Amino acid sequence: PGGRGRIGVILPANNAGMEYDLWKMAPEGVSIHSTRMKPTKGCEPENVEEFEKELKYSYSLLAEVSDIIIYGRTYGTHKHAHVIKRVIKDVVIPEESVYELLKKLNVRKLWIGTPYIKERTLEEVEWWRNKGFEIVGYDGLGKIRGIDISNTPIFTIYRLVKRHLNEVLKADAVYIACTALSTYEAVQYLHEDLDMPVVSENAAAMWEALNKLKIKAKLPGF
Amino acid sequence: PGGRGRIGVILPANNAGMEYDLWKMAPEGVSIHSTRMKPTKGCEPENVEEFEKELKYSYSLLAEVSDIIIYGRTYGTHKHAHVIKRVIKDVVIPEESVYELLKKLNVRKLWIGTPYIKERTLEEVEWWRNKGFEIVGYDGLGKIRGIDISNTPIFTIYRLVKRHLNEVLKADAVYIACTALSTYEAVQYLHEDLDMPVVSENAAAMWEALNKLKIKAKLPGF
Amino acid sequence: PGGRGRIGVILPANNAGMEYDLWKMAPEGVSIHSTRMKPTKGCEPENVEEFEKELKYSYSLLAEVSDIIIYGRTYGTHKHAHVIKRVIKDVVIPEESVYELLKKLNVRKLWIGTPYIKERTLEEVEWWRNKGFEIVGYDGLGKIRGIDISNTPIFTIYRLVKRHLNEVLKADAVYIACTALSTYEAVQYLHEDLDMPVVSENAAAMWEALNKLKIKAKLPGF
Amino acid sequence: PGGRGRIGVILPANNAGMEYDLWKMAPEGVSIHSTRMKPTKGCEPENVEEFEKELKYSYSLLAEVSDIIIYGRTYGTHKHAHVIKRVIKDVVIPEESVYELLKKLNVRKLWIGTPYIKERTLEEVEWWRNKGFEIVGYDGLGKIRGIDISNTPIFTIYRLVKRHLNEVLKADAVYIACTALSTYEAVQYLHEDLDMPVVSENAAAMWEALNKLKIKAKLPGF
Amino acid sequence: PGGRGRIGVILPANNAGMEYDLWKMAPEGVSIHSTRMKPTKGCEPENVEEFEKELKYSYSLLAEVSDIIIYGRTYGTHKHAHVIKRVIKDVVIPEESVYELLKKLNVRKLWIGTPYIKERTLEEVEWWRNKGFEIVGYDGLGKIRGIDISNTPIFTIYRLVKRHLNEVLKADAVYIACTALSTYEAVQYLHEDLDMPVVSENAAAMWEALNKLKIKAKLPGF
Amino acid sequence: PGGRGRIGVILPANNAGMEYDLWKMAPEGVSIHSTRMKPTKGCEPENVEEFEKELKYSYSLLAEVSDIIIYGRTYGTHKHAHVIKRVIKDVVIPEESVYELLKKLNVRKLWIGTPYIKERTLEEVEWWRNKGFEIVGYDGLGKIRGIDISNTPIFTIYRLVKRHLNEVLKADAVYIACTALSTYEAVQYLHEDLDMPVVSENAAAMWEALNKLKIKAKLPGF
Amino acid sequence: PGGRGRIGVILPANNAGMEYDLWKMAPEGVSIHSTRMKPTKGCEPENVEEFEKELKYSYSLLAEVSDIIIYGRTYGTHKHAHVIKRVIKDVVIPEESVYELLKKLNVRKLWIGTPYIKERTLEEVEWWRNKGFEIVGYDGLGKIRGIDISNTPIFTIYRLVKRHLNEVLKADAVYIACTALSTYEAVQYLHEDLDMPVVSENAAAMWEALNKLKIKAKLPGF
Amino acid sequence: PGGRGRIGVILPANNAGMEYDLWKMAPEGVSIHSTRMKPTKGCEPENVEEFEKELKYSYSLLAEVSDIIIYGRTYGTHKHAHVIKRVIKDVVIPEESVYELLKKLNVRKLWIGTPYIKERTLEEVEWWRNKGFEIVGYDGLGKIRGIDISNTPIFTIYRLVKRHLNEVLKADAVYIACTALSTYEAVQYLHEDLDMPVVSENAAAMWEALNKLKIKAKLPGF
């Protein structure tokens, strides 16, 4: 029973990494409660009313046990963030959390690691690039299926970044995209070794949620 | 990542105690993945096809990330267990787990603790009698709302039983119903103090799941 | 054998939280010794000589084993503090300890949490405002019986405050009234989460006592 | 809160050792609550109605917070135990606890250590002898004032016994009288070194109390 | 210094897992010393004199710092074990260690896990079958390059076996071939979960070496 | 599996101290991989092509499992360092690491400890003086055989320096030559006691290697 | 075997507290070696040649195993310190160590605690008083026999000082005389509670010895 | 303070290993007090009255602080043990302790390790044979000076025995002579590895002393 706080999380059916990260980061007295959503074809809502209806439903399943809710998907966050914010009051959108965290950390140069194939990696890059960050470098694991992404080993994530040391060192911080990756440990190793903030999407999400709820906690990587 | 094993769990929207218990019991390398279901009026589905359709849907959201699935509700387990077993192959029904565990523990005399009101506590008590157990005593917390049940403090659960020490010491074991109660700690204290197995629905569920997956683990209470 | 120090405490018959708090806060080599007083109707003595006679008696039971004595009641502290100070030389009055502690902490804005019901909580609010504090907010558990108050769970005390986050954040510190509440843990969680001193009556009492005796110690919440 | 159990204790004003022992022995979730009684001239009440009236009063101060009560005095236990049992239902009389414990331990030969002077040590001796125990030896610290007795150092109590190794090794167990002595540690050292049960009055009292309440616990010298 | 013992190990150039396993298993005061050998085409030497000459050379590099030597390759062990034993007195051949260990464990039914491709896994199979073991099942990771094999994650090795729970549970023990795999952890998880000895080639090698040197030690899966 | 990093090391056949030091200093996720070289007569190669050919061969045995390589010999480092750097790109030469470390530590006055005999210790002294250091003092263990050197006890190395306290205190740092000495512990004791950096050849080597790979770590002695 | 250092100590036959203190303070790798001297009538040598002859003899028994020697007596230190320094080169005289330590701590006001009776306590006071310290207060345990002094309990030493809190607080530091008292613990409690250096003769002696030998160590009380 | 017990020890001037061993073995509350004796030429006193006079003197220096005394020399124990027993009542002679311990351990076959040269090792070996033991083997460190003996490293003592594994494994136990050797650790390693009691002279001495005083303790090696 989360007497200190209860965090609800809506995530994709095949995401097997976020729940683990969230619990590992949850301070004493805090509990995580999740519900899943149908896996989707694209990365954005085809039918907005359809999306909003399903979103409201999942939200209704978490509304009473949650003190705050995290939208743990990337789907619909780029072009329909307003729909999500509309349905879920005070919702935490990991991608936006990353932005605030990086800003609060005075980050201008960024190195981006992802689990995606080149194409998506680049889009991810341009997204952040189009938000004012200078992207000194990037790379991806070249995966497609979420379950496969979730299965990524700690050090595979670690070497994904370390392999580009020379350029990684030119950044003010590193960002590891996708909530399907369990970055709880990887991010700590990277942070210690690179001596710079290493921000994962899951850690950023917890950072924002814990701040809004006002619960002291030492997140990993920064 | 749940390299050692991944346990999926389907639970009622307002259950805030089972996810906590499950993670506390999860041995290293094991992760818990859940999805919620619409809260229902009765304790048994009035539209079977409706139930089966919703059940199949939730199952489809956990099917890929799960190595095994736990049906963490009481709803539909008394009269429609066959429907659940049909939709979810190898599904773990906590109530049935309790039965197997008690049997394996050679339990004949039983004391039953619940979070329900007198009328429902009576049904619960009669149910286990009609299963071959001599019920030396019982009591309930007299609650109705699941969130309220989930909020039950460790020692409130502890005194729920201890208050009837004289009856209790006549049983071969104690059983604490409902997966909404977080019994991880309470059950350990009771087990040590009463010197007899104290079986909670959540512990029984993990016991069965961990056995089927073949993962060593020390559950609490027994 | 409190070779380092012995603290005597006079408390109401039905107070079950203060002794626990005091021992948990007692540093190594320090021991707590208590004696109880007849539970009373009002919150102030109608017969002063009666009060003084009973007060002197209880004091006589603690005088020889105590290095210092804490008057752990609220009864008679508002209008007859002088009587208490008269009978018990160097007595520690928790309510006055809170005042000195808050002052030493440069506190001007205060949020007050209590276990009482509307009326009495309103009197407590007024009592602190007249002492020179701006009371940005308050709330109570609405209890009457001391044993009931003592039974209050850690997180029930925690949420009593957290539920009013918006206002609490406007204060310089939080104060939790009544020595019947066991605040040893609750106060630590609140202090960490709110990032401001959270002063409970029991912690304030120990603070003053330990200072007078000159025994190093880390009290909780500030 | 003492969700696991609350033990009330009535003790003499100048006893500074039993509260410490009781708390050290208290398992998690158990709390100790005490109240004192006027120090008396003799070792037995001269006015029975007077005694019974004061006894009932102190009891009334502990009745509501206690699950069980320990009468931590020797006063009135030899000739008026029935009065005490009458006023306090299920009361635990340390001296009687020692007897049951020694019997349960199949003890026939006993060595007795006390904090009293020769005269009283002698009375303590034939009192236990009169219960059928063969008393292979004894000795006392020769103290009179309770506060002085309470101040007795761990190893002073240890050497009080060890100094008579010769005869002491002829007993089946050692018994250390008076609840004013803090025997929590001393008794452990003696038990390990002499390889036989070393029963102190405080440990015996907790043993009986914890048994009646049914709370698992590992007591000091046996 | 390895005052307790020094174990020398000859291994293939690209083996990155055995040195790690050996050190983790090395008890206090024991140190591991290694030297590498040219990577070879086949799995058996084509030129025996060539092999023997290179073998003697590597041995000469470890002879002075070693108390015993482990031949950590599979190359030349199937058809030329006698050559190895000839050059290196008391040499420990991991494959032969596995055999002795399994025999000492009274193993008749065996499940075999390997990192090789179907073809080679099949050869590894009937080789052990040819030693009288009934092989209830097997599987391989289908890898070729040693460095790739060494990179195998703990749980990848764990699931390599667990995925065949069904048949695996019919064996008396599990055997994981190749010293390039770091099985220190994987083997412990499997052993606990399957409740049967899980023997890795590296653990078997250390078992034999530590026995000959007579150094107490608790090895991984048995 | 050095998921964090893999350090290869080429060392003399009879060196039994460096591998131990390296592993003790290796942070989590880092592994050490070594290969030996034929013990040589002189301290410099008489046949350069011979040396280069053997050097290239050993390197080829470590090239694939290593992220970086340490040349753990003194042989050929004084007059043929360029040959080594040529064959092994980014190779770490412990002697040169010591120089950079001492420089980074702003060291001008140096005390030198060695395991060699008068003559050779004299050559080492001259070698460091020509590098720009004032050598306030020195001493050696007077050993010749590497295995003998490796067998040197922690405190023998400690007293080798401490015995000259008066001079040592005049230096800015102490340097202990030869990678055959296991200095992991000795260097820590010396550093604490002398309150100045105590640099061993092995620690310096790890310092440089870990820096190039960018892996956080706390080496001993400085 | 004190590889890090060996401290010899000459002490009075009946001193049972210094050896314990010295070992408790001895850092790892340091050992204490002692030899006793005939107990004497006065506090100063009657026959100087006699003293010097016996002193030289005891010294000869410690000369070879010691790196430095501590003269753990007060006898002959006030008027014949020069004789001691003459016989034992670099000898550590605890009383002189206290002086240097207090000076290095910029101490002007001092509170003195001793185990002696009034007369000696006063002489001790005048001694320090005649060395430039302002003695804000003092007290003694009033003991005569060294064995009795050695038997002094931790908290008896603690209260010896604490009992004079008001004046103790006026000092810059507290000094506890006599090496027969085991002050290892007492001094730590006092130091923490009084928030000022609390210097015992034994701690001062170790401070000086460890400094001369150059061995890092955290002495208690300052 | 040695509230639990005080052990006095008389040892040779240059013995630097026994005091360390004794303290490491001393259980909590036990302290060691020593005094030294003039180093002697032979291994047996040539002037008995001279010996007895010096023996009585040293004894007089330890008589008051000791609960029991250990004669930590070999000198005079072979032919004049009766003189020692005469002067020191209940004295513990390590050599005799070894005998009783070995006997109590039902030891018939013995392997003997010593720090002496061949000739003295022969006497030592013959001595124990003429005591009823079959001596399956032996060896010595070949040292003469006690300080040199004391300086013997843990593993040097360990290999002294291990080097003769084949002979050793034929014995029922191993015995390591001389109290100058610090065997506290060495003996534990040997005991674990050889799986048989490994008795050092110092451990045997403590065993006997602790038994006579009746203090529970876990010695090493057996």
PDB file of N, CA and C in Angstrom, chain F residues 115-142:
ATOM      1  N   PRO F 115      62.598  -3.893  -6.040  1.00  0.00           N
ATOM      2  CA  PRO F 115      62.809  -5.232  -5.495  1.00  0.00           C
ATOM      3  C   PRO F 115      64.189  -5.753  -5.912  1.00  0.00           C
ATOM      4  N   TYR F 116      64.887  -4.956  -6.718  1.00  0.00           N
ATOM      5  CA  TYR F 116      66.202  -5.308  -7.259  1.00  0.00           C
ATOM      6  C   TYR F 116      67.389  -5.201  -6.312  1.00  0.00           C
ATOM      7  N   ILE F 117      68.558  -5.547  -6.847  1.00  0.00           N
ATOM      8  CA  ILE F 117      69.808  -5.493  -6.106  1.00  0.00           C
ATOM      9  C   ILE F 117      70.542  -4.202  -6.454  1.00  0.00           C
ATOM     10  N   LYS F 118      71.362  -3.726  -5.521  1.00  0.00           N
ATOM     11  CA  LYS F 118      72.126  -2.479  -5.656  1.00  0.00           C
ATOM     12  C   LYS F 118      72.338  -1.920  -7.058  1.00  0.00           C
ATOM     13  N   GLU F 119      73.033  -2.681  -7.894  1.00  0.00           N
ATOM     14  CA  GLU F 119      73.347  -2.271  -9.256  1.00  0.00           C
ATOM     15  C   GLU F 119      72.118  -1.824 -10.024  1.00  0.00           C
ATOM     16  N   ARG F 120      71.160  -2.722 -10.189  1.00  0.00           N
ATOM     17  CA  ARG F 120      69.958  -2.386 -10.931  1.00  0.00           C
ATOM     18  C   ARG F 120      69.146  -1.255 -10.293  1.00  0.00           C
ATOM     19  N   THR F 121      69.092  -1.209  -8.964  1.00  0.00           N
ATOM     20  CA  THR F 121      68.356  -0.141  -8.287  1.00  0.00           C
ATOM     21  C   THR F 121      69.022   1.188  -8.629  1.00  0.00           C
ATOM     22  N   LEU F 122      70.338   1.149  -8.781  1.00  0.00           N
ATOM     23  CA  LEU F 122      71.088   2.342  -9.109  1.00  0.00           C
ATOM     24  C   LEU F 122      70.741   2.826 -10.515  1.00  0.00           C
ATOM     25  N   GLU F 123      70.474   1.892 -11.421  1.00  0.00           N
ATOM     26  CA  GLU F 123      70.128   2.241 -12.793  1.00  0.00           C
ATOM     27  C   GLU F 123      68.743   2.852 -12.858  1.00  0.00           C
ATOM     28  N   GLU F 124      67.848   2.376 -11.994  1.00  0.00           N
ATOM     29  CA  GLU F 124      66.470   2.862 -11.940  1.00  0.00           C
ATOM     30  C   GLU F 124      66.458   4.282 -11.408  1.00  0.00           C
ATOM     31  N   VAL F 125      67.283   4.524 -10.398  1.00  0.00           N
ATOM     32  CA  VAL F 125      67.414   5.839  -9.795  1.00  0.00           C
ATOM     33  C   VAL F 125      67.853   6.825 -10.873  1.00  0.00           C
ATOM     34  N   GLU F 126      68.897   6.466 -11.607  1.00  0.00           N
ATOM     35  CA  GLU F 126      69.418   7.321 -12.666  1.00  0.00           C
ATOM     36  C   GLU F 126      68.398   7.553 -13.768  1.00  0.00           C
ATOM     37  N   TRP F 127      67.592   6.540 -14.033  1.00  0.00           N
ATOM     38  CA  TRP F 127      66.587   6.636 -15.070  1.00  0.00           C
ATOM     39  C   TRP F 127      65.516   7.667 -14.732  1.00  0.00           C
ATOM     40  N   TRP F 128      65.154   7.760 -13.464  1.00  0.00           N
ATOM     41  CA  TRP F 128      64.137   8.710 -13.065  1.00  0.00           C
ATOM     42  C   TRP F 128      64.660  10.122 -12.867  1.00  0.00           C
ATOM     43  N   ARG F 129      65.926  10.227 -12.496  1.00  0.00           N
ATOM     44  CA  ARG F 129      66.540  11.524 -12.286  1.00  0.00           C
ATOM     45  C   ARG F 129      66.649  12.240 -13.630  1.00  0.00           C
ATOM     46  N   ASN F 130      67.045  11.504 -14.665  1.00  0.00           N
ATOM     47  CA  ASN F 130      67.181  12.079 -16.000  1.00  0.00           C
ATOM     48  C   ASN F 130      65.837  12.504 -16.562  1.00  0.00           C
ATOM     49  N   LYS F 131      64.760  12.020 -15.951  1.00  0.00           N
ATOM     50  CA  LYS F 131      63.418  12.375 -16.389  1.00  0.00           C
ATOM     51  C   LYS F 131      62.984  13.659 -15.694  1.00  0.00           C
ATOM     52  N   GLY F 132      63.859  14.213 -14.862  1.00  0.00           N
ATOM     53  CA  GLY F 132      63.532  15.450 -14.183  1.00  0.00           C
ATOM     54  C   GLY F 132      63.057  15.350 -12.746  1.00  0.00           C
ATOM     55  N   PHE F 133      63.524  14.345 -12.012  1.00  0.00           N
ATOM     56  CA  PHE F 133      63.116  14.205 -10.621  1.00  0.00           C
ATOM     57  C   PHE F 133      64.311  14.268  -9.688  1.00  0.00           C
ATOM     58  N   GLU F 134      64.117  14.888  -8.529  1.00  0.00           N
ATOM     59  CA  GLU F 134      65.171  14.943  -7.537  1.00  0.00           C
ATOM     60  C   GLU F 134      64.915  13.708  -6.689  1.00  0.00           C
ATOM     61  N   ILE F 135      65.887  12.816  -6.634  1.00  0.00           N
ATOM     62  CA  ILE F 135      65.715  11.592  -5.887  1.00  0.00           C
ATOM     63  C   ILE F 135      66.277  11.662  -4.483  1.00  0.00           C
ATOM     64  N   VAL F 136      65.403  12.006  -3.547  1.00  0.00           N
ATOM     65  CA  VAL F 136      65.758  12.154  -2.146  1.00  0.00           C
ATOM     66  C   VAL F 136      66.172  10.871  -1.424  1.00  0.00           C
ATOM     67  N   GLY F 137      66.019   9.720  -2.073  1.00  0.00           N
ATOM     68  CA  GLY F 137      66.405   8.474  -1.431  1.00  0.00           C
ATOM     69  C   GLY F 137      65.894   7.238  -2.141  1.00  0.00           C
ATOM     70  N   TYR F 138      66.446   6.078  -1.802  1.00  0.00           N
ATOM     71  CA  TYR F 138      66.029   4.833  -2.432  1.00  0.00           C
ATOM     72  C   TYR F 138      66.559   3.592  -1.725  1.00  0.00           C
ATOM     73  N   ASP F 139      66.024   2.435  -2.102  1.00  0.00           N
ATOM     74  CA  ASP F 139      66.435   1.159  -1.526  1.00  0.00           C
ATOM     75  C   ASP F 139      65.778   0.044  -2.341  1.00  0.00           C
ATOM     76  N   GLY F 140      66.304  -1.173  -2.222  1.00  0.00           N
ATOM     77  CA  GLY F 140      65.758  -2.300  -2.958  1.00  0.00           C
ATOM     78  C   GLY F 140      65.713  -3.548  -2.100  1.00  0.00           C
ATOM     79  N   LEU F 141      64.919  -4.533  -2.509  1.00  0.00           N
ATOM     80  CA  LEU F 141      64.796  -5.776  -1.755  1.00  0.00           C
ATOM     81  C   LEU F 141      65.938  -6.727  -2.075  1.00  0.00           C
ATOM     82  N   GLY F 142      66.719  -6.382  -3.094  1.00  0.00           N
ATOM     83  CA  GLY F 142      67.847  -7.203  -3.494  1.00  0.00           C
ATOM     84  C   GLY F 142      67.481  -8.588  -3.975  1.00  0.00           C
TER      85      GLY F 142
END
